[PDB]
């Protein structure tokens, strides 16, 4: 059974390891995927790798006009969204002493502002009963040297899954966060290795799929046990 | 990737094959290609459950609070299948009693089924568990809430969640993952965002995630399957 | 200005009061003006502890796993002081055993002291607890960790933490606050915890006592059902 | 040796948001406990009234903590008047309710500027004055662990605040500086204690974190919510 047969998915960060692995799994599970990213060349290469049932959309998700353009494309080509994987994110290490206004704004714009507006602008297209997955991080629950803004931003992302669970419940839209650990640390991790992108994708699939139909507002750690022991 | 049968040729042991959740899980496991042992106290209801499941299932009568019963179970598994890939340690019982009402007998009944029994269930499965296998523990939303008259049940289910952490550590050299599932309301109640009780088959689907290779980088977790109850 | 005596004329009952955190807490409580009952199994160690505390203390020999010993305790408390303002249910014992090693006896001893004893300690205190009183439970960082060979201890301490939530609900009509304290390492394995702890050391028993005093005192009057980690940051980073 | 009666005797405390509410009640208790307090806020008149209410051992400083230059001015005052900081209560915060569909860029930036950016630069700029072994308290909220209707940005920002307590515990451990978050509930039906909290009850919990009683307490989230989030 194709677990996303004929579903429409939008994946932001189709330039990340996890966004591409997710797109591949989703196409293997029968979905039509829009992969979204800032860098056109890697996007087009990714779409060529995936090979079928995929459209690449160049967009900077921090720019409201780019989001409007994305959604117009999705509306015209597929008409509605079943699964939204809001997978933005970038880290720059700076200690508290080293933080500048620019570093703060870059970190929060990509990890938080971009996410909020990605999901806001998807709402008209999202089907009732749909599924929204947010990318948090183990950093959201840890105290890692020089991850000040990144960890704080990923904590913000996890919180938005709770709030959107409440706000969207009338439409039966589930919102859940995935919190990856180290993806290709290993020493602190019970499984004794970094995770493969396809293992993160499989977890995202769980959340996108009907197997998680009674799962809402959670933080799914995909970290080999790092944060759990 | 996708597979018609996500547990093909795997051997699963499910305790609480008299419960709604244990039964629904056995059905889904068989649908996924597994061979299932369903384990429970009441033989007749077990044999009816095995008839409902319909194929690739052995019913085993066993009271998991009795060590000799566990030894009998594992002998049966060893003779029939030879190894265990997935262990769903799912026996449980709830009785409501407030603190002022708690008796020694109530305490012991709750802890013996939910904690002592679970410990010995898993301990005695270790020689048969395959490296790289998956163990799923049934905790509960009760393990993180303060529900009137759930004193011992909630405490015991918090203990169960703890054991998933400890056993993640202790079994890591064998690459055996240990995870807890924490159901909310299933079939009956006890604000929930999804606005309804869960179905046993929805819990089963989440256990399947943990049993399956889709959760291969998932270890030590508490997976709430509660329609959002504990998350907002 | 400040209060000289933060527990002035309050009556406290501390189980496990004969040593460690229970003893440090009894000392601080007495310093803060409380009258304390210290409870333990061995008369000689109790008498030594009472002598160290030095004043405003009654030692009561009792095995808190034995219902009859609890009844005897609370008869004494009622006679001598009438009612209880603070109950620090501070039982606890650890024996390391891996899953493979666990015997029924090891299970029962761990749960009897950490959980059964606790439940009955609190149950039997109820008629004497003043409304607005404070009940402090001893959990552990082990309750949230996956520590090799701590199977039963960790699980028991998780159960303790849970009871603080349930008892918060049950006792809210009486305005009795119930909170858990979760110590880290307190003065090889100890060195391993110190290295993983931000503050880079084990805690002193008096620092645990001071945290229990927060929960016993009016400073925590709007704190209920919590798990207060007192671990130098071990579990928080 | 026994306990000290005045639990912040001669310590220097800086309290942002010190003109009202929790920050004011904290300032009053800190002064009762023997501290010297700097109360920080945006409006002169309210600050002067607050300082008159506190009544002694207090300096009011007008500053918008979202402006780096206002923070530099604050810390120059503290450095000249007291010389060092023992306790920092980084008590920023403001809520505007908006649902996801309603959020604008301006609403987002206001919420994050006051609750997160302001906090970060408040603590950053205090570092040179903070004594080794000092205590930093951050104001998070119960919102940081809940899914409340129309609290999208506020809740998210308060979760970010709690995270920073973790990171700063790691970064500041070599100086033995403790960083903890306080998460208030309702302050003056779902709460076990069956009432809102008084500002003085929040101040007492902040006092615990500021004081030596919490010397082995680091990186935590102290819920002061009458049980709301715990049951």
Automatic annotation (TrEMBL), chain A:
Record's keyword annotation contains Transit peptide: no
Ranges of residues in domain Ketoreductase: 7-183
Family of the protein in this entry: Belongs to the short-chain dehydrogenases/reductases (SDR) family.
Amino-acid positions noted as binding NADP(+) 2 in the UniProt annotation, renumbered to this chain: 15-16, 18, 38-39, 60-61, 87, 89, 150, 154, 181, 183
Keyword field: Nucleotide-binding, Oxidoreductase
Annotated residues for binding of NADP(+) 1: 15-16, 18, 38-39, 60-61, 87-89, 150, 154, 181, 183
GO molecular function: nucleotide binding; oxidoreductase activity, acting on NAD(P)H, oxygen as acceptor
Annotated protein name in UniProt: Alclohol dehydrogenase/short-chain dehydrogenase
SMART domains: PKS_KR
Record-linked InterPro entries: KR_dom, NAD(P)-bd_dom_sf, SDR_fam
Organism: Ralstonia sp. DSMZ 6428
Origin superkingdom: Bacteria
Keyword Oxidoreductase found: yes
């Amino acid at each position: 059974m194709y677990r996303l047969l004929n579903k429409t998915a939008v994946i932001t960060g189709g330039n990340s390891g996890i966004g591409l692995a997710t797109a591949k799994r989703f196409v293997a599970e029968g979905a039509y995927v829009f992969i979204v990213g800032r860098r056109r060349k890697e996007l087009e290469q990714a779409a060529a790798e995936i090979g079928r049932n995929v459209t690449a959309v160049k967009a900077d998700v921090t720019k409201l006009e780019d989001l409007d353009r994305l959604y117009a494309i999705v509306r015209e080509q597929r008409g509605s969204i079943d699964v939204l994987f809001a997978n933005s994110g970038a880290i720059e290490q700076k200690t508290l002493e080293e933080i500048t206004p620019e570093h703060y704004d870059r970190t929060f714009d990509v990890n938080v502002r971009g996410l909020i507006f990605t999901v806001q602008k998807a709402l008209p297209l999202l089907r009732d009963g749909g599924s929204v997955i947010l990318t948090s991080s183990v950093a959201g629950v840890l105290g890692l040297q020089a991850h000040d803004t990144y960890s704080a931003a990923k904590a913000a992302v996890r919180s938005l899954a709770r709030t959107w669970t409440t706000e969207l419940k009338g439409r039966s839209i589930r919102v859940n966060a995935v919190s990856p650990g180290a993806i290709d640390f290993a020493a602190a991790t019970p499984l004794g290795r970094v995770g493969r992108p396809e293992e993160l994708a499989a977890a995202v699939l769980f959340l996108a799929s009907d197997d998680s139909s009674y799962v809402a507002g959670i933080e799914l750690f995909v970290d080999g046990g790092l944060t759990q022991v």
